[PDB]
Amino acid sequence: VQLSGEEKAAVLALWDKVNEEEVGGEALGRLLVVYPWTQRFFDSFGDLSNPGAVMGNPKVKAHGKKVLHSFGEGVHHLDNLKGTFAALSELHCDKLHVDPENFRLLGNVLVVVLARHFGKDFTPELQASYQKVVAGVANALAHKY
């Protein structure tokens, strides 16, 4: 993705403050609640009936953490998104058969969660840069489809 130097610096500064466990668990949980067809891929996590069961599920928190860690890698490798996500693209296409539209959905949920956590500090300009990042990750994950 193409950010100005000022934009990149603001993106990186916010990431310093991101708790990958709290944010990641909340982001995956909301995806599963707001877009319930996504629960199909996570049957092995057990009880995903209602919002309470999803948000408190230890497997949802642990996997959400892994997803955010991987996002974090993208944020620190903005020049080589395709290379950073090549292996994960293969897994998601070849093995899991996830439609790419869902990568966009998770990206937008992550932005909503960042907005919830950072409030007024998550300015319209900062969201605009994060939208770039999110789209770049989605495109990199879709590359082997």
């Binding site: 909301r30 609640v33 932005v111 907005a115």
Partner: protein
């Protein structure tokens, strides 16, 4: 806005928005123009700068129409008829742009009402905004 439980969540959440509906509408427009520059195309006659008076006024109109909608959840097509014609027949707004505005409004609510923006409420709101979008694009169907 659909199931009984969703109508209840939407009415309750919008009560917390209260008199800030106009302000949030304006902010959501700002987040949309910056995050998704393709949308600025529909507003050539506006000053689109931060704090612009026209964006403020238009955000108020958007907030009022959403407030209307929440009061008429059982008949959205009836309540929003004038707006369907405007957006679909006169303006020819690309349906994708409604999904973008919805995301920006949800983002804006998260900023201002973090304790009230629970997973259950987020899900109901999403459905509500999708129902409004369908109505505004229904002339395409």
């Amino acid at each position: 806005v659909l199931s009984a439980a969703d109508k209840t969540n939407v009415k309750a959440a919008w009560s917390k928005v209260g008199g800030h509906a106009g302000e949030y509408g304006a902010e959501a427009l700002e987040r949309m123009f910056l995050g998704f520059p393709t949308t600025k195309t529909y507003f050539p006659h506006f000053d689109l700068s931060h704090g612009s008076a026209q964006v403020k006024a238009h955000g108020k109109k958007v907030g009022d129409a959403l407030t209307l909608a929440v009061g008429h959840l059982d008949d959205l097509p009836g309540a929003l008829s004038d707006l369907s014609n405007l957006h679909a027949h006169k303006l020819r707004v690309d349906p994708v742009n409604f999904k973008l505005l919805s995301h920006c409004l949800l983002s804006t609510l998260a900023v201002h009402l973090p304790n009230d923006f629970t997973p259950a409420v987020h899900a109901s709101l999403d459905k509500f905004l999708s129902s409004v979008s369908t109505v505004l694009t229904s002339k395409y169907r």
